[PDB]
Design an enzyme around this catalytic site. Structure first.
Site, mmCIF file in Angstrom:
data_model
loop_
_atom_site.group_PDB
_atom_site.id
_atom_site.type_symbol
_atom_site.label_atom_id
_atom_site.label_comp_id
_atom_site.label_asym_id
_atom_site.label_seq_id
_atom_site.Cartn_x
_atom_site.Cartn_y
_atom_site.Cartn_z
ATOM 1 N N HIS A 28 4.127 -8.126 10.086
ATOM 2 C CA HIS A 28 4.641 -6.747 9.912
ATOM 3 C C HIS A 28 3.534 -5.702 9.868
ATOM 4 O O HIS A 28 3.798 -4.536 10.177
ATOM 5 C CB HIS A 28 5.653 -6.547 8.719
ATOM 6 C CG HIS A 28 5.052 -6.639 7.360
ATOM 7 N ND1 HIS A 28 5.397 -7.659 6.484
ATOM 8 C CD2 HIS A 28 4.111 -5.865 6.766
ATOM 9 C CE1 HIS A 28 4.675 -7.471 5.394
ATOM 10 N NE2 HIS A 28 3.898 -6.393 5.508
ATOM 11 N N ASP A 64 6.991 -14.071 9.130
ATOM 12 C CA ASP A 64 6.069 -12.958 8.879
ATOM 13 C C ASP A 64 4.664 -13.475 8.640
ATOM 14 O O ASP A 64 4.151 -13.509 7.513
ATOM 15 C CB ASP A 64 6.579 -12.108 7.724
ATOM 16 C CG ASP A 64 5.876 -10.799 7.588
ATOM 17 O OD1 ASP A 64 5.142 -10.411 8.538
ATOM 18 O OD2 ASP A 64 6.063 -10.148 6.548
ATOM 19 N N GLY A 116 0.838 -1.713 0.282
ATOM 20 C CA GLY A 116 -0.586 -1.872 0.544
ATOM 21 C C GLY A 116 -1.135 -3.253 0.294
ATOM 22 O O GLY A 116 -2.283 -3.534 0.641
ATOM 23 N N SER A 120 0.658 -6.166 1.303
ATOM 24 C CA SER A 120 1.201 -7.090 2.311
ATOM 25 C C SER A 120 0.144 -7.650 3.236
ATOM 26 O O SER A 120 -0.830 -6.954 3.531
ATOM 27 C CB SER A 120 2.351 -6.466 3.075
ATOM 28 O OG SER A 120 1.878 -5.395 3.871
ATOM 29 N N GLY A 121 0.312 -8.920 3.615
ATOM 30 C CA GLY A 121 -0.665 -9.619 4.442
ATOM 31 C C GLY A 121 -1.621 -10.435 3.595
ATOM 32 O O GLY A 121 -2.115 -11.490 4.023
HETATM 33 C C1 LIG Z 1 -5.588 5.409 2.460
HETATM 34 O O1 LIG Z 1 -4.933 4.196 2.917
HETATM 35 C C2 LIG Z 1 -3.651 4.038 2.546
HETATM 36 O O2 LIG Z 1 -3.060 4.801 1.809
HETATM 37 N N1 LIG Z 1 -3.137 2.920 3.138
HETATM 38 C C3 LIG Z 1 -1.827 2.363 2.993
HETATM 39 C C4 LIG Z 1 -1.496 1.294 3.827
HETATM 40 C C5 LIG Z 1 -0.222 0.748 3.796
HETATM 41 C C6 LIG Z 1 0.754 1.223 2.913
HETATM 42 C C7 LIG Z 1 2.126 0.632 2.894
HETATM 43 C C8 LIG Z 1 2.248 -0.746 3.074
HETATM 44 C C9 LIG Z 1 3.521 -1.302 3.124
HETATM 45 C C10 LIG Z 1 3.708 -2.736 3.562
HETATM 46 C C11 LIG Z 1 4.444 -2.750 4.915
HETATM 47 C C12 LIG Z 1 3.697 -2.042 6.072
HETATM 48 C C13 LIG Z 1 2.276 -2.546 6.302
HETATM 49 C C14 LIG Z 1 1.560 -1.726 7.367
HETATM 50 C C15 LIG Z 1 2.389 -1.637 8.650
HETATM 51 N N2 LIG Z 1 3.804 -1.293 8.405
HETATM 52 C C16 LIG Z 1 4.405 -0.237 9.041
HETATM 53 C C17 LIG Z 1 5.866 -0.003 8.809
HETATM 54 O O3 LIG Z 1 3.759 0.528 9.740
HETATM 55 C C18 LIG Z 1 4.457 -2.129 7.391
HETATM 56 N N3 LIG Z 1 4.368 -3.472 2.483
HETATM 57 C C19 LIG Z 1 3.604 -3.951 1.478
HETATM 58 O O4 LIG Z 1 2.394 -3.720 1.414
HETATM 59 C C20 LIG Z 1 4.309 -4.710 0.419
HETATM 60 C C21 LIG Z 1 5.614 -4.845 0.234
HETATM 61 C C22 LIG Z 1 6.194 -5.586 -0.896
HETATM 62 C C23 LIG Z 1 5.895 -6.951 -1.008
HETATM 63 C C24 LIG Z 1 6.385 -7.678 -2.070
HETATM 64 CL CL1 LIG Z 1 6.025 -9.387 -2.167
HETATM 65 C C25 LIG Z 1 7.175 -7.092 -3.039
HETATM 66 C C26 LIG Z 1 7.484 -5.744 -2.938
HETATM 67 C C27 LIG Z 1 7.002 -4.981 -1.873
HETATM 68 N N4 LIG Z 1 7.520 -3.668 -1.659
HETATM 69 C C28 LIG Z 1 8.741 -3.143 -1.783
HETATM 70 N N5 LIG Z 1 8.684 -1.850 -1.624
HETATM 71 N N6 LIG Z 1 7.371 -1.563 -1.440
HETATM 72 N N7 LIG Z 1 6.657 -2.643 -1.453
HETATM 73 N N8 LIG Z 1 4.620 -0.569 2.939
HETATM 74 N N9 LIG Z 1 4.514 0.754 2.761
HETATM 75 C C29 LIG Z 1 3.337 1.345 2.755
HETATM 76 CL CL2 LIG Z 1 3.372 3.085 2.636
HETATM 77 C C30 LIG Z 1 0.397 2.269 2.059
HETATM 78 C C31 LIG Z 1 -0.861 2.849 2.110
#
Ligand SMILES: COC(=O)Nc1ccc(-c2cc([C@H](C[C@H]3CCCN(C(C)=O)C3)NC(=O)/C=C/c3cc(Cl)ccc3-n3cnnn3)nnc2Cl)cc1
Length: 238
Positions: free
Chosen positions: A44, A93, A186, A188-189
């Site tokens: 993802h 994933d 932030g 994930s992965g």
């Molecule tokens: C200055 O730099 C920055 O600010 N960098 C920055 C980089 C990425 C993000 C970021 C990342 C993610 C990623 C998916 C995205 C990862 C990147 C690519 N992507 C998309 C949609 O483009 C999916 N998800 C997780 O990390 C974890 C999920 C999660 C996992 C578990 Cl086990 C439990 C609950 C969770 N959750 C439920 N609700 N929330 N979490 N989602 N949103 C954001 Cl805004 C924010 C900031």
């Protein structure tokens, strides 16, 4: 990471921070070193990533502030996404990043062991989720690598918590009934690391959840033991 504490330098030497340089450089996802040119992460992470040329892997980092224009990184040669991957909520994933250069192992960067196919039955009692993610739904990326000890949850129990989803055996859940500790945006992965007989194993890849650390909403991880042959297929190719 919600309800976690700062890590000490070298505590998780397999943890990496995957950055994107498009449009500007920032942390994108976590990842784990599994071999000298291999990072295991979540599929993802690459939504709208058109080329591996915009990716930078930083290993041996505790604090995001250690990363400047002059900090060395590993370029990515190839992004390998599982063929059945559609979305985090449907499973598969998992992704591999094939690095352009070899990681020299040391006290700051070394690989984590994959779980054993024989250890598919073992119950992991000491599991930690790590990352630079938010500490609540509306937050920012943390400077210092955070850690949180979380208990594993059975497939049956996780399926009860996610009515409307199909929680498969290729997923592994972790969380407290009352919530409070989990992965968040932030993270994930990144890894879900479990210590069994003094050896750390990459039991999960931070994948998804409904909100962060909510009660009766375990975090959902890719069950790494179920992809050991897929990993070997891609990394041991003739
Ligand atoms: C200055 O730099 C920055 O600010 N960098 C920055 C980089 C990425 C993000 C970021 C990342 C993610 C990623 C998916 C995205 C990862 C990147 C690519 N992507 C998309 C949609 O483009 C999916 N998800 C997780 O990390 C974890 C999920 C999660 C996992 C578990 Cl086990 C439990 C609950 C969770 N959750 C439920 N609700 N929330 N979490 N989602 N949103 C954001 Cl805004 C924010 C900031």
């Amino acid at each position: 990471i919600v309800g976690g504490t700062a890590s000490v330098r070298g505590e998780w030497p397999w943890q990496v921070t995957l950055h994107t340089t498009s449009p500007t450089q920032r942390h994108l996802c976590g990842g784990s070193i599994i071999g000298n040119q291999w990072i295991l992460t979540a599929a993802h992470c690459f939504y709208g990533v058109e080329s591996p040329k915009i990716l930078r892997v930083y290993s041996g980092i505790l604090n995001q502030s250690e990363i400047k224009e002059d900090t060395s990184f590993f370029g990515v040669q190839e992004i390998i996404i599982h063929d059945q991957y559609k979305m985090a909520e449907s499973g598969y994933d998992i992704a591999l990043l094939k690095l352009e250069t070899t990681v020299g192992y040391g006290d700051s960067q070394r690989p984590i062991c994959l779980p054993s196919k024989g250890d598919r039955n073992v119950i992991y009692t000491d599991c930690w989720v790590t990352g630079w993610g938010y500490r609540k739904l509306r937050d920012k990326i943390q400077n210092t690598l955070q850690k949180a000890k979380i208990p594993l949850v059975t497939n049956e129990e996780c399926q009860k918590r996610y009515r409307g989803h199909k929680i498969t055996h290729k997923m592994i859940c972790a969380g407290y009934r009352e919530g409070g500790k989990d992965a968040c945006k932030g993270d994930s992965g990144g890894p879900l690391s479990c210590k069994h007989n003094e050896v750390w194993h990459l039991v999960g890849i931070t994948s998804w959840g409904e909100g962060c650390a909510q009660r009766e909403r375990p975090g959902v991880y890719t069950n790494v033991v179920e992809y050991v042959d897929w990993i070997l297929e891609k990394t041991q190719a003739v």
